[PDB]
């Protein structure tokens, strides 16, 4: 999964640097663990 930039976009370099800065802070990961798991209310444990 990647950010789609048009061929010759001015936002080809700053978006790619924004990709790195969110990753270096783990902010990509701290969004993923938050949104999937506060919504995970039917955790598979409950039917088991």
């Amino acid at each position: 999964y990647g950010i789609a930039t048009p061929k010759g976009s001015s936002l080809g370099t700053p978006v790619n640097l924004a990709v790195l800065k969110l990753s270096e802070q783990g902010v990509l990961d701290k969004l993923k663990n938050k949104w999937w798991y506060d919504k995970g209310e039917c955790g598979a444990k409950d039917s088991g």
Partner: protein, 48 residues
Amino acid sequence: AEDLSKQTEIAYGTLDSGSTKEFFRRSKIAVFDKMWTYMRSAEPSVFV
């Protein structure tokens, strides 16, 4: 409450306005946090 928060078979409601509901709002214990994410996520409303 650890046996409460780990099973979603049972619903958890408190009063519409009181010292109990506000206690779980400003709480930051992980067990107490996970309950308040459930108390807000009420379909239908758990509160009375």
